[PDB]
Write a protein that binds this ligand. Structure first.
Ligand SMILES: CC#CCn1c(N2CCC[C@@H](N)C2)nc2c1c(=O)n(Cc1nc(C)c3ccccc3n1)c(=O)n2C
Length: 315
């Protein structure tokens, strides 16, 4: 016989689209790659247990091509599957409230996410893909599966993959409004004609090489091309935060001196991030785990500091 239920496809889960689907044929046969709340259903045949429901689909047509662009800000042919494949595990994670931040209960090596995520609920960033806008907001409200799958999709990391906090933040920064952000640097050797540079946007809020912000304020000897070693020093900073990164190295975090940091313990192959946040005292957040002390020595990779406006006084 002939049987057909009605369902809606969507790329953004806001704009729906009426379809009537033949209950013999798989969704793969009708819409192509299709997903139900993360589940690949391309090869399942429609249950009447599905009438009224929203499947995500690959952006096959132009209507879809434009909704997906406007919501996500990408045209990566693969973005959508990546986002559903990741959502299909993120939906099953636990996002506990830990000291009033949303964290993630450790699974599938999401250590780097929990710390990235905890960093966000802590610094002033505004996302440009409405997708992130929307998903972040639920995440703050402690509903974070979507935000997580979204980060996975924007980073081309699949659930399980080993990820790096720095690179992760590079990706989210790319999709965040930091135009007004402005860094001016100068690098002086003792006998050179000391060259200066100006950095704008993301390039202005990330530095790789030292954890210490005040250190960078005072000068950092760098592998320069002079006759001696040259000091790199920060001339001017315009931004709502800065991020200092560097390879994992034993470092001490002092209450009241930073906003937060990332500890990486292990090696390239095997290791674990943790997040330290400066509040009434030092709190160390490790997924669902919480500990406290007053001072913290340990192998740090990333330290973030609140900022707005800084002129150096060094001549
Ligand atoms: C709302 C809004 C907005 C503006 N916008 C648009 N469009 C395209 C058509 C649809 C319409 N929504 C406007 N696409 C965008 C952005 C945007 O801000 N960022 C973040 C970004 N990206 C980069 C590369 C940055 C670089 C430096 C500083 C900040 C930056 N911020 C993006 O990544 N993409 C892809």
């Amino acid at each position: 016989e002939v049987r057909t239920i009605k369902v809606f496809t969507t790329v953004d889960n806001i704009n729906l689209h009426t379809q009537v689907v033949d209950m013999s044929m798989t969704y793969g046969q009708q819409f192509g790659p299709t997903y139900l709340d993360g589940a690949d259903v391309t090869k399942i045949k429609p249950h009447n247990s599905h009438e009224g429901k929203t499947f995500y689909v690959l952006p096959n047509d132009d209507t879809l091509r434009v909704e997906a662009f406007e919501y996500y800000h990408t045209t990566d042919p693969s973005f959508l599957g990546r986002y559903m494949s990741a959502l299909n595990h993120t939906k099953k994670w636990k996002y506990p409230q830990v000291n009033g931040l949303t964290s993630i209960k450790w699974a599938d090596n999401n250590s780097y996410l929990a710390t990235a995520l905890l960093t966000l609920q802590q610094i002033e960033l505004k996302f440009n893909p409405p997708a992130l806008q929307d998903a972040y907001y639920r995440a703050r409200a402690g509903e974070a599966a979507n935000f997580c799958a979204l980060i996975l999709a924007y980073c081309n990391k699949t659930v399980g993959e080993l990820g790096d906090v720095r690179e992760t933040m590079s990706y989210l920064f790319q999709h965040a409004n930091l135009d007004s952000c402005k860094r001016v640097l100068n690098v002086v050797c003792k006998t050179c004609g000391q060259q200066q540079t100006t950095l704008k946007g993301v390039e202005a809020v990330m530095y790789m090489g030292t954890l210490s912000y005040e250190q960078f304020k005072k000068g950092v000897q760098i592998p320069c091309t002079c006759g001696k070693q040259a000091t790199k020093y920060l001339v001017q900073q315009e931004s709502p935060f800065v991020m200092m990164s560097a390879p994992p190295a034993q470092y001490e975090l002092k209450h009241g001196t930073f906003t937060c940091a990332s500890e990486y313990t292990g090696n390239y192959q095997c290791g674990h991030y943790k997040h330290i946040t400066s509040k009434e005292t030092l709190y160390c957040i490790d997924g669902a785990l919480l500990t406290k002390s007053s001072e913290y020595k340990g192998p740090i990779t990333d330290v973030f500091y609140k900022e707005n406006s800084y002129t150096t006084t060094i001549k």
